From a paper:
[name] and its fission and budding yeast orthologues [name] and Dpb11, respectively, are scaffold proteins that mediate formation of multi-protein complexes in a range of essential DNA replication and repair processes. Bioinformatic analysis suggests that only three of the [name] domains in the yeast [name] homologues, and four in the vertebrate [name] homologues, possess the required cluster of residues needed to bind phosphorylated peptide motifs. Despite the structural similarity of these phosphopeptide-binding [name] domains, genetic and biochemical studies show that they are nonetheless selective and specific for the phosphopeptide sequences with which they interact. To gain some insight into this, we have determined crystal structures of segments of yeast and vertebrate [name] that contain the two most N-terminal phosphopeptide binding sites (BRCT1 and BRCT2), in complex with phosphopeptides derived from a number of different known ligand proteins, including [name], and used this to develop consensus patterns that encapsulate the individual specificity requirements of these two independent binding sites.
As determined by mutagenesis studies, the [name]-pS387 peptide binds to the middle [name] domain (BRCT1) of the closely packed array that forms the N-terminus of cTOPBP1. The phosphate group of [name]-pSer387 is recognised by a network of hydrogen bonding and ionic interactions centred around the side chains of cTOPBP1 residues Thr114, Arg121 and Lys155, which form the conserved triplet common to all [name]-domains involved in binding phosphorylated peptide motifs. In addition to these core polar interactions with the phosphate, the side chain of [name]-Asp386 hydrogen bonds to the side chain of cTOPBP1-Lys118. Upstream of pSer387 and Asp386 (−1, relative to phosphorylated residue), the peptide backbone of the [name] peptide main chain forms a distorted anti-parallel β-sheet with the main chain of a loop connecting cTOPBP1 residues 137 – 141, with an additional interaction between the side chain of cTOPBP1-Asp138 and the peptide nitrogen of [name]-Asp386.
Author numbering:
A (entry chain B): 380 to 387
B (entry chain A): 9 to 30, 37 to 230, 234 to 243, 258 to 282
Amino acid sequence: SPVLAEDS
Amino acid sequence: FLVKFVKSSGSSEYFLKALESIEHLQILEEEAALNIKENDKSLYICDPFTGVVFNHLKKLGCRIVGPQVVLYCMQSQRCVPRAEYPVYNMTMADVTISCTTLDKDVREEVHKYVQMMGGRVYRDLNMSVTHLIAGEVGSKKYLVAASLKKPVLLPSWVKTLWDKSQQRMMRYTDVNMEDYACPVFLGCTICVTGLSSSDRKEVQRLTAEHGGQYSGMNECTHLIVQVHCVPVQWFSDSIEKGFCQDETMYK
């Protein structure tokens, strides 16, 4: 996916 | 689309400089803009972004932009940002930020100023993000941005770009990234055990120099050994590569 690290 | 310059009090010189650079553009006096009662889907140039006029147009939902945006895009309509919020200038055009390990309210302030300076914001760290804004090291976002050697800057970088670009026209590279880089150990309290007194002093010094805290279990975040229990190679590699290293890679 384009997300490398999700939001906290 | 039509362009309506809104003459107002308190405006900066850049408003005038934008009028000296222009037929499908109207020039409205403050009064004619105060008598607007709907949203004609035209582009409104406002300066400043304070006052009953600006907040009136903003309340109506109007497309608002600052004169610095005009001086940036000139006669390129496509260059103008296409968003639901007013853009004051283009200092951060081409910047896409994400935030990590920040207070939610500060996070939203950062988002606000970036968007107002022509930048993009995402809540996740996707492949479009050009800059990571961090309040401290160690997060998944942080480690990922490090591995890709994306800049990891403090919030002040955004703030200083806002405050300065209020007076003059500039871009985000007109500030030195290094002076706003997230310190390698910001947010870390480093503790040691089994190290020579000399090495111990070195860890102290380098910790303080790279934004961390030294303390000689609840207080420590990392424990250097011969809480994260890591070897000294983690400390030295963190300093050498310019980012706090993934502790799980040093176990």
